[PDB]
Amino acid sequence: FFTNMVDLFNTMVITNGDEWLKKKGNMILKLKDMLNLTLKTIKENSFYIDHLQLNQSIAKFQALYLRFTELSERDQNPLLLDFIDFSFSNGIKASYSLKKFIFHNINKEKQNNFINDATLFVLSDKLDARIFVLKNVINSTLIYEVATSGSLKSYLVEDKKPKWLELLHNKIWKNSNADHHDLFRFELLQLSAIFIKADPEIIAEIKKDIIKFCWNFIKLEDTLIKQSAYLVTSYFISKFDFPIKVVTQVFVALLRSSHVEARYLVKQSLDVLTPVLHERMNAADTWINWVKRVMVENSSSQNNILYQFLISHPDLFFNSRDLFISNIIHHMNKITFSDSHTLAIDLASLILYWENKSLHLREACTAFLIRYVCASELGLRAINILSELISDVKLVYFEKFILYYCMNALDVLYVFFKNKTIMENLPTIQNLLEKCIKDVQEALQKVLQVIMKAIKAQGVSVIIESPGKTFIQMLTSVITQDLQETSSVTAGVTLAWVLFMNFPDVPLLTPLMKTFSKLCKDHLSISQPKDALEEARITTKLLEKVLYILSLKVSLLGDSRRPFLSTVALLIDHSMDQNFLRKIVNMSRS
């Protein structure tokens, strides 16, 4: 009967428009008690408790009362009473009320009338949830006013009382006993978040008095709130004027981290202070020395180091004890022995920034960058800034350094490409390159392409000149002729193409006439279906595409140019090569 009448009311409420009590609803009182009276007998009985038969009907009157709340105009009293009746049993937390609050929030002095009513209602402490949800409304009201304005301007442009400061100085003086769900801390964080909101306002010393109560909150320390009050302090400190002894101690408080790291605040507190103290350091360095002792007092904390990574951007702009920081950094490089690398990348860049505007440690820095690759990004590019820094362990301490060989293939390539900027070193490097002859060959093609940029001369044509070219090229032919070295042939072709890019001279062409022959064999092997999975075609596409590209490119389609077009007809038998022959005509048309 508790349910069935309510829909019997609701179906009548459905039919009637204003209401069938015409937006007055004395039975709404007779029901709202009856539900608590249903909640009364609910405490006696246990048949089908927490029934949806209740719970849906429980939503229904909740929907109904919220509808009348929108329908009525008394925009103070049912707000608490519903929150009271919802604190009474089975807390709904109506998103519709959150929507109606969003409908209520987004000057209406009805909001200001609610605002002192809010100052009343949450101070009307009598449950905790009733007080808590009020604060949830209150902070959201506080936030949306200042957020959806220039700066809180419905209140900031003459809120027609210090109704806040009536409540605020009352609260700031109170601090009463500094709530199972950290509701005090929730009320504190609400008090904190409200005070964070009003910190851009017109209260200077009363806020500095309110921040003094926040120092009592900073005196309060349970771990979340402790950093939070530390976070609360910094936003005051960026805003308000700061004593230097308070400035160092807060930086000392910044030096005191914890377990569940409020680094987000700590970076933000750094984002407060690293302007302010450095501007004050610009306005004047004793704080950094006290910091350096504190930095010494890190006790293995790399949280200090990542904080110091931000702090080194003023500090390398300061540029006081750079190698001392770097000597710490190598001991920190020893400590991680990819987070430290970025810190090392920043610290290298910081050291690079001052010196552009020891090298052995920079050489040891490259040793860690290689060792970071060998125990497996930016670190290639960080070696390239290190390349521009070390050209502002020599080359030979990696005779043993698969993936390690390939990573060193990339590394020695950038090592060679940078240190090139030679004519004896490169065959001596080719002596090392002939030694380390263990795709990685595609990376070796990139190294050869780096060697090809070195093979560019600009005034060295028949000046002494090509043993390194010939020894590779026969080794390109010999590796090709064995078995399955198609990409290796192509690399040797790309070598020969680089050699043709280097030289106007047939001995390449005779394996190359053998190559497009063997590719034509490989074409008919690959066009044995008239359509494998993906790779060997597209390679031999690009393999023959390069193989086509050179054999025409100079001149003089050979004496077996008759064998040359015989592949081309079998190519026309295949179904591909749209642009490729289209270019290949165009030069032959030329």
Binding site: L52, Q56, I196, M501
Partner: protein, 614 residues
């Protein structure tokens, strides 16, 4: 490196005391002993100098009892090298030189002591308990020495045991008794006597706090050992105290710090990691003592709420051995309420789902029972859906509540994806030729910063598994069907082979699901896998009773057809529901009616709406 630096250091430190530089040079050498630039193997050389220099130190600053201003600063000079080393080589020889110094500082413990020594003691115990070379019995004797000095310093005078780390020889044939002295002390006696006063007064709240905080920090480390004597060690004839001691550990926890709970949690996880203690305790314990008052404290501990619940989730998941109906009723209400508490964590929610679905099997297993118990079990089965309906129907509509604002998230999810992002051939041719908590995010006070996710892929996993556990739920629903001969059913196999009854509420529950999920299906930006998920939702609703399947479809059809005007994947949903050769005679009847209106108004529809109708 026991070199010209180290020679110049000890020479300038000629006198062992001097002024501030004497403190400063004391710290910096230990700091390089920790963290110099390089290390050319001076550690065995320096420790050969150090264990004497520590004997020179332990002579100079001997004992406990507040040797404060330079001498604990000398103990701070002592602490700074007390561990600043690494047990790499020649460890055992100087260790015997340290074992002399270790027994030397073994007593002195109370009234501003325990700082320099424990830092040395861990550096010794790590090098000791890596091995089991039996010099650690002298440490255990040194331990039991201070473990008399401690109840003297505590229980009369009204710290940092690491007893499992002390007993990290990983065998323990040396008995529990030394810890079992403290174990039976802290457990079988209420280690504070204010605690029987306060626990009776409940049903550190007074100012006598740091003592209870001491007695908590004691019993926490006392618990910390007890799993290393429970997990690799089986005790005998000590079984009545341990649930009560668990109830005692349940009774007390202070909440200033946080790893207090966190260790005690992972302890209780290890305490849950036992097997017979898992087999005994919840059958014996009213685990409702582990209420929301099990996990209480800061909103820091809201981050601790998962593993708190997840272990409690792991608890009943293990303890799923015939939990009684009213007990299962609390199990449903709490955990599905915890599952309803969807603002915590999806993984927590998805886990709590799989708890309940496994619990549904237990509800199925124990619910297969008395015909006296069957309608309450059917009411439990009604409660099961009443969980299940409201489970998704909140959360999916909560998800649907998110879906509007998720366009702004899509405005971000694309935006971060927006922020994320043949010269041999060519050049040779060349020179040779916010009305929600989005505004609450917009506030400068924030705990964690704003994360990022593929929310649909978040939602699809949310939608899959929740529909997945929904799919078996209705599959099990053909068991508590009423005797259909009340309706005089000529096919008693066919009735109760599928759904046979529901409440008018439960129908209204069921009809909401399609009213949810179809409107729920809107989040698919510009798939067919979701259509296969939609098929699963149809395959779910395929397992239903026909009159309901008729009646809900009636409510579905305009809500279908109006929403069908949005996009065409609903036709695949229609293609699903017809093509099953059971739902075909039903779904003909509605659409035959439901088209039969609109044919007259085929005159002027959109070409979409034509093709939609067509």
């Amino acid at each position: 490196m026991s070199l010209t630096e180290q020679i110049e250091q000890f020479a300038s430190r000629f006198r062992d005391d001097d002024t501030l530089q004497s403190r400063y040079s004391t710290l910096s050498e230990l700091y390089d002993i920790m963290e110099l630039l390089n290390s050319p193997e001076d550690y065995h050389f320096f420790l050969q100098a150090v264990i004497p220099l520590l004997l020179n130190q332990l002579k100079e600053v001997p004992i406990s009892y507040d040797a404060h201003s330079p001498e604990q600063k000398l103990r701070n000079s002592m602490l700074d090298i007390f561990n600043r080393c690494l047990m790499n080589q020649t460890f055992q020889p100087y260790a015997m030189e340290v074992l002399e110094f270790l027994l030397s500082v073994l007593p002195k413990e109370n009234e501003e002591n325990g700082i320099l020594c424990m830092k040395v003691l861990t550096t010794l115990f790590k090098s000791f308990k890596s091995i089991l070379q039996d010099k650690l019995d002298s440490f255990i004797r040194i331990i039991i020495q201070i473990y008399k000095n401690t109840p003297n310093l505590i229980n009369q005078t009204f710290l940092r045991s690491s007893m499992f780390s002390f007993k990290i020889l990983s065998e323990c044939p040396i008995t529990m008794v030394t810890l079992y002295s403290s174990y039976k002390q802290l457990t079988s006696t209420s280690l504070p006597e204010f605690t029987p006063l306060i626990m009776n007064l409940l049903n550190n709240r007074p100012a006598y706090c740091d003592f209870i905080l001491a007695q908590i920090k004691a019993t926490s480390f006392l618990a910390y050992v007890f799993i290393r004597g429970y997990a690799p060690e089986f005790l005998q004839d000590y079984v009545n105290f341990v649930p009560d001691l668990i109830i005692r550990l349940l009774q007390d926890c202070p909440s200033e710090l946080s790893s207090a709970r966190k260790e005690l949690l992972h302890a209780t996880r290890h305490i849950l990691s036992t097997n017979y203690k898992k087999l005994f305790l919840p059958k014996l314990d009213y685990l409702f003592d582990e209420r929301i008052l099990i996990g209480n404290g800061f909103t820091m501990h809201e981050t601790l709420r998962p593993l708190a619940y997840s272990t409690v989730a792991d608890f009943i998941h293990n303890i799923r051995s015939e939990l009684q109906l009213s007990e299962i009723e609390k199990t449903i209400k709490i955990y599905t309420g915890y599952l309803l508490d969807e603002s915590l964590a999806l993984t927590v929610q998805i886990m709590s789902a799989k708890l309940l679905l496994n619990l549904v099997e237990r509800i199925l297993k124990l619910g297969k029972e008395n015909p006296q118990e069957a309608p309450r079990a059917k009411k439990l089965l009604m409660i099961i859906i009443d969980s299940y309906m409201n489970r998704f129907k909140t959360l999916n509509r909560q998800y649907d509540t998110i879906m509007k604002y998720y366009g702004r998230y899509e405005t971000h999810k694309k935006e971060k994806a927006e922020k994320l992002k043949d010269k041999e051939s060519e050049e040779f041719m060349r020179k040779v030729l916010v009305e929600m908590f989005d505004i609450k995010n917009y506030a400068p006070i924030l705990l964690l910063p704003t994360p990022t996710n593929d929310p649909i892929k978040d939602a699809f996993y949310l939608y899959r598994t929740l529909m997945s556990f929904l799919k078996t739920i209705i599959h099990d629903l053909k068991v508590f069907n009423p005797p259909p001969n009340e309706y005089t059913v000529a096919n008693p196999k066919l009735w109760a082979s599928v759904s046979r009854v529901f409440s008018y509420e439960e129908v209204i529950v069921f009809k909401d699901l399609f009213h949810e999920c179809i409107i729920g299906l809107k989040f698919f930006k510009d798939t067919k896998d979701a259509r296969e998920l939609m098929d699963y939702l149809a395959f779910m609703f395929m397992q239903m009773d026909n009159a309901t399947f008729n009646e809900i479809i009636e409510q579905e059809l305009p809500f279908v057809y109006e929403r069908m005007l949005e996009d065409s994947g609903l036709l695949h949903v229609a293609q699903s529901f017809l093509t099953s050769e059971i739902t075909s005679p039903n779904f003909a009847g509605i659409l035959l009616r439901f088209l039969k209106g609109k044919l007259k108004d085929l005159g002027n529809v959109d070409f979409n709406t034509s093709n939609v109708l067509i």
